[PDB]
Design a protein around this ligand. Structure first.
Ligand code: FMN
Ligand code: SF4
Ligand code: SF4
Ligand code: SF4
Ligand code: SF4
Ligand code: SF4
Ligand code: SF4
Ligand code: SF4
Ligand code: FES
Ligand code: FES
Ligand code: FES
Ligand code: ZN
Lengths: 554, 156, 612
C-alpha cells in the first residue's frame, strides 16, 4: 500500500481504518484535538484537514487507497486550522496559571506552537457552570466538549451522571438540571478527571490545609497508600523504584511530619478482620454473597443502586479509615496526647477516599486526604531531588505490612490477602482461577475441612451490573471501581491510561516481591495490636466496623 | 404519586426508543417537564437523569419552565421576520417585560419564537393560546396585550 | 380490498360511483389547511355545519386541503357549480347557503380577483394563475377529501400500489424509478433510483423506510401542505418503496408542532390498516409492512439523515461522519431508506404513468414538477406547483401576481438558510438542478421568499445566521463556534460598529465554516453571507461607512424634532445627557445630533414631536 504524501512515497499498513491513524503509525503526525485519551472518538475538532483530489476533508474519516495523493500542509489548510484553534481559544477560559492541566495540556501546547498571540474573535459570554461541591471539581469554561468524560462515566464506569445538554453554542457537559455533583449518583471515582484533557474536570486541592496544619503546634501524622508509591515517580520523569515509599517518608520527615505510617498495615488489619467475617458467614451461610467494602466508590455505588445488598457489604471499614481510627483511638492514647492534637494526613491515589474521610460515619478521623498529584506537587514545590534522598523506614508501630497487604493497590489484592489469611488459618487445598471476561476473575476455593466457595474479582465499575445479573454462585465479590484497581485511581498522575496502569501494577508487584512477611498473621505488630487494644468483639466492632445507609433523591 | 406518568409509560412500555413521545405527552399533561417527573421517569425507565435531561434540552418543544396562562408564539420565519416580527418582539418586551423563552414571576404570560406557521399571508404573525393574530405592528400587539391584561384585571 | 385485487377493484368502482354522485350533488368543500385555518376556516366549517343542520338540508360537507390561494382567505367550493368563494366570512355564511346551495345564483363579491385584470373569475380552473401552473402532484384541487381514504380510492388512488404489488416485482419498480429521472426533492437532488438500488442491495433481511416530513427551512410549508391535503399519496409511495427495497417497517417523521399533519397522517395509517393495505399481509402477496408516525420534538438539524435516525431512536439529533451511509446501516444499524415527502408522493404518480409520460414534464435532467411555497409582500402567495423549467420571474409575476402596491423586487431566497440569494440577474433562468449548481445556487427544499427594496441584505444574513447558530447541534468546532462568531460580526455590522477588518474576518471565517463543518447544516451555514457578499457587497461597504441603503437597520434612524410639529415649550434644555437642545425659547426649537449618542430619550416630554 503506497501513498503519496506531499509528493513523496510513503508505505502504510494494508488494513487501516483512516488515513490519519495510518500516517500516525508510519510516524507522520497531523495536528488534531480529537485523540486526547483512550476514550476519544474522531470527528469533532475538524483540524485534521487534508487535500485529496483537489478537495479538503478530514483525514480521520477517510479510507486510504492505493496511489492516493494527499497534501497535509497547504495555505488553505493552514488558514483553516489556525481559524479553528482561534475559535476554540476565543471562548476558552485562558487562565493556565491556576489550571490543573498547566504543562500537560494539548490545547496550551497548540496555542504555543501555532503562534496565537491575540484573540481575533471575541470571547462571547457563555452560561458557564462552576461546581466545587465534591472532591471532583467541574469548570465548564475550560471544556472543549470532546465528550471523553461522558463516555468514560457511561460506558466504562456505568454510572452516566454527566451528559451533553442543550445544543449549539450553549452546548455543555453537566449533571441533570446542573445539580451539584455531590448531590447526584456520582461515585467520585475520578475516572472522568483521569481522562479529561483540560482543567474542566479537576481534583479539589487541599495543600493549603496541610501547610496550615504543619505550621501549627499539633502532631501531624501521615500515612501512604500502597498504590501511591508505585505511581508517584511519573511526575518526576524517572524510572521506577522499590525505595520510593521510604524516600517519601524521608521527605515528609524533612517537611515536618511527626510520624509517617504505612496504610498497608491498615490493609493487613482489614484483610484479617474481613477474612474472619467471611469465614463466619460461610459457616452460618448468612448474608451471602459478601461484598468487599474497601473501595469507597463501590460503597457509594451500592448505596445508590443496590440498597438490598447493603447488608451483604462487609462491615469492615477501608484500610484508610481503619488505620486512622486505630491511630486516633489507640495510638493517641499510647502517645500521651489528646485525640484533638493529632492532624492525620492520608496520601491516597483516589478521589473517592476524600469523600469517605468526610462521611458522617468517619467524620473527624482523617483530617485531610491528599492525592498522588498533591504529594508530587509538595515534593516539586520543595525542589528536593527525590532521586537522591536517602530512604528511611516507616515509623513504628504501623510501618510494616505483609506483601499481600501491600498488594491492595492493584485489583485482586484484597481477595488475595483474604485467601492468604484463610490459608494460614485453615488452609486452601487448591484454587482454580478463571477469566470470564476482561476485568473479571472467578476463583473456586476448597478448604481443608470441605466447605468450598467461589470468589470473584471485578475491577472497573460497570462490569458489576451484568456480573451480578447473570451469576448467583459466587460467595465473595471484590469490586474495585477503577480499572486495574487503585493503581489507576482518579488521583493518580496524568496521563492515566491502560499501559501506564499496567506499568504501575508491575512496579507494585516488584515492590511486593522484596517484602519478607508473607501473611498478616506473620505481622507481629498487627498481632500485638490485637492482643493489646483489640481483644474483645466490642472494641473490635467500635474501631474496625462501620454501617451503610441507602441513598436516594426526592 | 405519578399515576398518569405510569399510564403514559406503560402505554409506551418503558421503551427507550419511545422517550421523545413519552416526554411530549408528559409535557402536554404538565405544561412543562418538572424535575421530579424526570427523576421518576428515570428510575422507572432505567435511564440516568442526565441522559433524559440532555434529550429534553436538545429539542425546542420541551421546556424546563412552566408555560403561562396565556402562551405567546411569535413567528420568526423569513416572511414574518421581513414583515416586522422584531417590532412585535420589541413591543411584547416593552409591554410584558419578558424576552422570548421566558415567563413572568406571576406566570401570567410566556413568549416563544417559532418557525413558519404556514400562514405567511398574515405576516407578521402571532398566536396566543391558539388564536392567530396576523398583520401585526407595535401598536396592535400592545393593544392586544393590554386588553388581555384588562380582561384579567376584571375577573380577579 | 383485503386479500385479492378483484375485490379491491369492485370496492374502488363502487367508491368511484359514489364520488360521481357526490360531484353531481350539491357539496360544500372548505379549505381547512394551514393558512386558511389561521384566517378562520374552522369557524366557517362550523358555520356551514350549524346552518345545514338548523335548516335540515343530503348536501355533503367535506373538509379539503390547500388549494394554492392561501392568501385569499378561507376557500369554499360549490360542487355542481364550481364557484370558489374566497375571503369568506362566518357572518356571510347564511347568504352563501341560501343564495347558492338552493337557488344557485353566484355571489359575485365573494369571487377570486385576478391581480392582472382585477376581475372576479367564476372559477380557478379558468384563471391565469391556474393556467400558468403545472399540476402533477397537486390534484383534485378544492374537491378532495383529506380525512378519508374513500375519496382517495375513488380518485384512482392506490391503484399503483395494487398493480406494483401484484404485477411488478421490486426490481422492475426500482428500474422504472431509475428511468423516470426522479431526483430527490429534499434539496440534495440525488437520483431516487440509485438510492433505492443501494438500500435494496444492502445485505440483510431487516430494513426500514423512513419519510422525512421536515421542510429543511424555517420559512417553508409545502411539505406540510402536501402531508395535510393528501397523506394517502405519501403513504402509498412509502408502501411502494417498502416493497421495492424489501423493507418491513416504515417511519413517518412529522414535527410535533404540526398537529393537523400528524393527526391526518395517523388517521390515514389507521384507515389503511383497517382496509388491509397495511398489516401482516397485503393482497395475499406475502409482503408485510406497518407504518409509525414518529413525532419530531423539533430540531432543524434533525433534517440531516444521521441526525434524523438518531432522533428516531430517542437520542439527541446529532449527526455523525457519513461512512457508513444510512442506506447500509441506519436505524439500529440496519439498511434504511430516507426520502422526502415530495419524493414519495412522486412514486405512485410514476407508477401510474410510464417513464416517458413522466419525462414529458420538466427538463431532460429534471423531469416532473416541483411544489413551491412563495412568501413576502406579494399579490398571490401560497403553495404552487410548476415544471422544472419555469423561471423565477414567471413564478413571481405570472403565478403570484407580482408585488403589492408599494413594493418592488430586490432579491429572492430560494432555499432558506441553506439556499441562496438571487438578485435581478438570476430570475431569468429556468429552475433546474443542474443549471443552479454552476450559478452558485440550488433549487432548495421548495421555499421561495421575495425581498423588496425596504429590506436590508445585511439584516437578511444576520437573520439567517441567527437561526443557524441557534440550530447548530454543537458537535463540531467549525459550526458551533464559527456560526456564533459570524453572527456576532453581523450584529456589529447592523449596529454601525463594523470595520473592514470585520469584513475580511467574516469572509475567511465563512470559508472555514463552509469547508470544515461536519454535516450539511454547518457546510451551508455561511451560504447567506457568501451570496449576499457576492451580490450585495456595496450594502456591506455602506454599513461600514455608517449608513444603511434601506431604512430598516434601527441602529441609525436619527431622531429629529419637527419644527412645524414642535410646540416650543422649551423643556428640552438640560433634559438630555448631551444637552444638545439648542432650541429657541418661545417658538419652535431645533435639535442637533452632533453630540447625541442616539440613546432614545427624545420621546420623554414632547407632543409626539420626536420620531424614532
Ligand atoms: C440541516 C439540514 C436539514 C435538512 N432538512 C431536510 C428536510 O427537511 N427534508 C428533506 O427531505 N431533506 C432534508 N435535508 C436533506 C437530508 O439530509 C436528505 O438528503 C434528504 O432527507 C433525502 O431526501 P431526498 O432523497 O428525497 O432528497 C436536510 C439536510 C440538512 C443538512
Ligand atoms: S485547559 Fe488549562 S492549561 Fe489548557 S489551555 Fe485551558 S487554561 Fe490553559
Ligand atoms: S467521578 Fe466517576 S461517577 Fe462521578 S462523573 Fe466522574 S466518572 Fe462519573
Ligand atoms: S469536561 Fe473534559 S473530558 Fe468532558 S467534554 Fe469537557 S474537555 Fe472533554
Ligand atoms: S478502585 Fe481504588 S482508586 Fe479507584 S475508586 Fe476504588 S479505592 Fe479509589
Ligand atoms: S456542522 Fe453544526 S449541526 Fe453539523 S455536526 Fe457540526 S455542529 Fe452539528
Ligand atoms: S421638549 Fe420637545 S416639544 Fe418642548 S421645546 Fe423641546 S423639542 Fe419642543
Ligand atoms: S436621543 Fe438621547 S442622547 Fe440623543 S438628543 Fe435625545 S435624549 Fe439626548
Ligand atoms: S481528528 Fe478531529 S475531526 Fe479529524
Ligand atoms: S413565515 Fe411566519 S407564518 Fe410563515
Ligand atoms: S390552505 Fe387554503 S388555499 Fe392553501
Ligand atoms: Zn442595513
Amino acid at each position: 500500500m503506497k501513498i503519496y504524501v506531499d509528493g513523496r512515497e510513503v508505505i502504510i499498513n494494508d488494513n487501516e481504518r483512516n488515513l490519519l491513524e495510518a500516517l500516525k503509525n508510519v510516524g507522520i503526525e497531523i495536528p488534531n484535538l480529537c485523540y486526547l485519551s483512550e476514550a476519544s472518538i474522531y470527528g469533532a475538532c475538524r483540524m485534521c484537514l487534508v487535500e485529496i483530489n483537489g478537495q479538503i476533508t478530514t483525514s480521520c474519516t477517510l479510507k486510504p487507497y492505493e496511489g492516493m495523493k494527499v497534501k497535509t500542509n497547504t495555505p488553505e489548510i493552514y488558514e483553516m486550522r489556525r481559524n479553528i484553534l482561534e475559535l476554540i481559544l476565543a471562548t476558552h477560559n485562558r487562565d493556565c496559571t491556576t489550571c490543573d492541566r498547566n504543562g500537560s495540556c494539548k490545547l496550551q501546547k497548540y496555542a504555543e506552537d501555532f503562534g496565537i498571540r491575540k484573540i481575533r474573535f471575541e470571547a462571547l459570554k457563555k452560561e458557564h457552570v462552576r461546581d466545587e461541591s465534591a472532591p471532583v471539581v467541574r469548570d465548564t469554561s475550560k471544556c472543549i466538549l470532546c465528550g471523553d468524560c461522558v463516555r468514560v462515566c457511561e460506558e466504562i464506569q456505568g454510572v452516566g451522571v454527566i451528559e451533553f445538554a442543550k445544543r449549539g453554542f450553549e452546548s455543555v457537559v453537566t449533571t441533570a438540571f446542573d445539580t451539584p455533583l455531590i448531590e447526584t449518583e456520582c461515585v467520585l471515582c475520578g475516572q472522568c478527571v483521569a481522562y479529561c484533557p483540560t482543567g474542566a474536570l479537576s481534583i479539589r486541592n487541599d495543600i493549603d490545609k496541610l501547610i496550615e496544619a504543619l505550621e501549627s503546634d499539633k502532631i501531624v501524622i501521615g500515612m501512604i497508600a500502597p498504590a501511591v508509591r508505585a505511581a508517584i515517580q511519573e511526575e518526576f520523569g524517572i524510572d521506577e523504584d522499590v525505595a520510593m515509599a521510604e524516600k517519601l517518608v524521608s521527605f515528609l520527615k524533612t517537611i515536618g511530619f511527626d510520624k509517617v505510617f504505612d496504610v498497608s498495615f491498615g490493609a493487613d488489619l482489614v484483610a484479617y478482620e474481613e477474612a474472619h467475617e467471611f469465614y463466619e458467614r460461610l459457616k452460618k451461610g448468612e448474608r451471602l454473597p459478601q461484598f468487599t467494602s474497601c473501595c469507597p466508590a463501590w460503597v457509594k455505588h451500592a448505596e445508590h443502586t443496590y440498597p438490598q445488598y447493603l447488608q451483604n457489604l462487609s462491615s469492615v471499614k477501608s484500610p484508610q479509615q481503619a488505620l486512622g481510627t486505630v491511630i486516633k483511638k489507640i495510638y493517641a492514647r499510647k502517645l500521651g496526647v489528646p485525640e484533638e492534637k493529632i492532624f492525620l494526613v492520608s496520601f491516597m491515589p483516589c478521589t473517592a477516599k476524600k469523600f469517605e474521610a468526610e462521611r458522617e460515619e468517619h467524620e473527624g478521623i482523617v483530617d485531610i486526604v491528599l492525592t498522588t498529584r498533591e504529594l508530587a506537587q509538595l515534593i516539586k514545590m520543595s525542589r528536593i531531588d527525590i532521586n537522591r534522598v536517602e530512604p528511611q523506614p516507616f515509623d513504628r508501630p504501623y510501618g510494616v505490612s505483609s506483601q499481600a497487604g501491600l498488594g491492595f493497590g492493584k485489583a485482586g489484592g484484597v481477595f488475595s490477602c483474604v485467601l492468604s489469611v484463610l490459608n494460614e488459618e485453615i488452609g486452601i487445598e487448591k484454587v482454580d482461577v478463571k477469566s470470564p471476561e476482561d476485568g473479571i476473575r472467578v476463583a473456586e476455593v476448597t478448604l481443608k475441612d470441605g466447605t468450598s466457595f467461589k470468589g470473584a474479582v471485578i475491577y472497573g465499575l460497570g462490569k458489576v451490573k451484568k456480573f451480578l445479573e447473570e451469576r448467583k454462585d459466587v460467595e465473595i465479590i471484590e469490586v474495585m471501581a477503577c480499572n486495574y484497581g487503585c493503581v489507576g485511581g482518579g488521583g493518580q498522575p496524568y496521563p492515566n491510561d491502560s499501559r501506564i496502569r499496567e506499568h504501575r501494577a508491575k512496579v507494585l508487584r516488584d515492590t511486593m516481591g522484596i517484602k519478607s512477611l508473607l501473611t498478616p498473621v506473620e505481622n507481629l505488630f498487627l498481632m500485638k495490636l490485637y492482643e493489646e487494644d483489640l481483644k474483645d468483639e466490642h472494641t473490635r466492632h467500635e474501631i474496625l466496623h462501620t454501617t451503610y445507609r441507602p441513598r436516594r433523591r426526592y | 404519586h405519578f399515576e398518569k406518568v405510569e399510564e403514559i409509560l406503560k402505554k409506551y412500555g418503558y421503551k427507550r426508543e419511545n422517550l421523545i413521545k413519552i416526554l411530549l405527552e408528559i409535557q402536554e399533561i404538565y405544561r412543562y417537564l418538572p424535575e421530579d417527573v424526570i427523576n421518576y421517569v428515570s428510575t422507572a425507565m432505567g435511564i440516568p437523569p442526565a441522559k433524559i435531561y440532555g434529550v429534553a434540552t436538545f429539542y425546542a418543544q420541551f421546556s424546563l419552565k412552566p408555560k403561562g396562562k396565556y402562551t405567546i408564539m411569535v413567528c420568526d420565519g423569513t416572511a414574518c421576520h421581513m414583515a416586522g416580527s422584531p417590532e412585535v418582539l420589541k413591543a411584547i418586551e416593552e409591554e410584558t417585560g419578558l424576552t422570548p423563552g421566558n415567563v413572568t414571576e406571576d406566570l401570567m404570560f410566556s413568549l416563544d419564537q417559532v418557525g413558519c406557521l404556514g400562514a405567511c399571508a398574515l405576516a407578521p404573525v402571532m398566536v396566543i393560546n391558539g388564536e392567530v393574530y396576523g398583520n401585526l405592528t407595535a401598536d396592535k400587539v400592545k393593544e392586544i396585550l393590554r386588553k388581555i391584561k384588562e380582561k384579567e384585571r376584571e375577573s380577579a | 380490498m383485503f386479500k385479492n385485487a378483484k375485490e379491491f377493484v369492485q370496492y374502488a368502482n363502487k367508491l368511484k360511483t359514489l364520488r360521481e354522485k357526490k360531484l353531481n350533488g350539491v357539496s360544500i368543500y372548505v379549505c381547512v389547511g394551514t393558512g386558511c385555518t389561521a384566517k378562520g376556516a374552522l369557524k366557517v366549517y362550523s358555520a356551514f355545519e350549524e346552518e345545514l343542520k338548523k335548516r335540515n338540508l343530503k348536501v355533503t360537507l367535506n373538509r379539503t386541503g390547500c388549494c394554492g390561494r392561501c392568501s385569499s382567505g378561507p376557500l369554499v367550493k360549490i360542487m355542481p357549480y364550481r364557484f370558489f368563494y374566497s375571503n369568506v366570512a362566518p357572518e356571510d355564511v347564511p347568504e352563501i347557503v341560501d343564495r347558492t346551495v338552493l337557488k344557485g345564483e353566484p355571489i359575485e363579491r365573494l369571487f377570486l380577483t385576478d391581480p392582472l385584470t382585477g376581475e372576479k373569475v367564476p372559477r380557478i380552473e379558468d384563471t391565469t394563475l391556474f393556467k400558468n401552473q403545472d399540476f402533477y402532484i397537486m390534484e383534485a384541487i378544492g374537491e378532495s377529501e383529506c380525512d378519508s381514504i374513500e375519496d382517495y380510492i375513488a380518485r384512482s388512488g392506490y391503484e399503483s400500489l395494487v398493480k406494483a404489488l401484484t404485477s411488478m416485482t421490486p426490481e422492475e419498480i426500482i428500474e422504472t424509478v431509475k428511468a423516470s429521472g426522479l431526483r430527490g426533492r429534499g434539496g440534495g437532488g440525488f437520483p431516487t433510483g440509485l438510492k433505492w438500488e443501494f438500500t435494496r442491495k444492502a445485505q440483510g433481511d431487516i430494513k426500514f423506510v423512513v419519510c422525512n416530513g421536515d421542510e429543511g427551512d424555517p420559512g417553508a410549508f409545502m411539505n406540510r401542505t402536501l402531508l395535510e391535503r393528501d397523506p394517502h399519496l405519501v403513504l402509498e409511495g412509502m408502501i411502494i418503496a417498502g416493497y421495492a427495497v424489501g423493507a418491513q417497517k416504515g417511519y413517518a417523521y412529522i414535527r410535533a408542532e404540526y398537529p393537523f399533519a400528524v393527526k391526518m397522517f395517523k388517521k390515514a395509517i389507521e384507515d389503511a390498516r383497517k382496509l388491509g393495505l397495511l398489516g401482516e399481509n397485503i393482497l395475499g402477496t406475502g409482503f408485510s409492512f406497518d407504518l409509525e408516525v414518529k413525532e419530531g420534538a423539533g430540531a432543524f438539524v434533525c433534517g440531516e439523515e444521521t441526525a434524523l435516525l438518531a432522533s428516531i431512536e430517542g437520542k439527541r439529533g446529532m449527526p455523525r461522519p457519513k461512512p457508513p451511509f444510512p442506506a447500509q446501516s441506519g436505524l439500529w444499524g440496519k439498511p434504511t431508506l430516507i426520502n422526502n415527502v415530495e419524493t414519495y408522493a412522486n412514486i405512485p404518480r410514476i407508477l401510474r404513468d410510464g417513464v416517458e409520460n413522466y419525462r414529458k414534464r420538466g427538463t431532460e435532467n429534471s423531469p416532473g414538477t416541483k411544489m413551491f411555497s412563495v412568501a413576502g409582500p406579494l399579490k398571490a402567495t401560497g403553495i404552487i406547483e410548476v415544471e422544472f423549467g419555469t423561471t423565477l420571474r414567471d413564478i413571481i409575476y405570472n403565478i403570484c401576481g407580482g408585488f403589492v402596491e408599494g413594493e418592488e423586487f430586490k432579491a429572492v431566497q430560494i432555499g432558506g438558510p441553506s439556499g441562496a440569494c438571487l438578485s435581478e440577474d438570476f430570475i431569468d433562468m429556468p429552475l433546474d438542478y443542474d443549471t443552479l449548481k454552476k450559478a452558485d445556487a440550488m433549487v432548495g427544499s421548495g421555499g421561495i421568499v421575495v425581498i423588496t427594496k425596504k429590506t436590508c441584505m445585511v439584516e437578511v444574513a444576520r437573520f439567517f445566521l441567527d437561526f443557524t447558530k441557534r440550530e447548530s447541534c454543537g458537535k463540531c468546532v467549525p459550526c458551533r463556534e464559527g456560526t456564533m462568531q459570524a453572527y456576532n460580526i453581523l450584529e456589529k455590522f447592523t449596529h454601525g460598529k463594523a470595520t473592514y477588518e470585520d469584513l475580511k474576518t467574516l469572509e475567511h471565517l465563512s470559508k472555514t465554516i463552509k469547508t470544515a463543518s461536519l454535516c450539511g447544516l454547518g457546510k451551508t451555514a455561511p451560504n447567506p453571507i457568501l451570496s449576499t457578499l457576492k451580490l450585495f457587497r456595496e450594502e456591506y461597504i455602506a454599513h461600514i461607512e455608517g449608513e444603511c441603503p434601506s431604512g430598516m437597520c434601527t441602529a441609525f434612524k436619527k431622531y429629529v424634532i419637527n419644527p412645524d410639529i414642535c410646540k416650543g415649550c422649551g423643556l428640552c434644555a438640560r433634559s438630555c445627557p448631551q444637552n444638545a437642545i439648542t432650541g429657541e425659547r418661545g417658538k419652535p426649537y431645533t435639535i442637533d445630533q452632533e453630540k447625541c449618542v442616539k440613546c432614545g430619550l427624545c420621546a420623554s416630554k414632547c407632543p409626539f414631536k420626536a420620531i424614532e
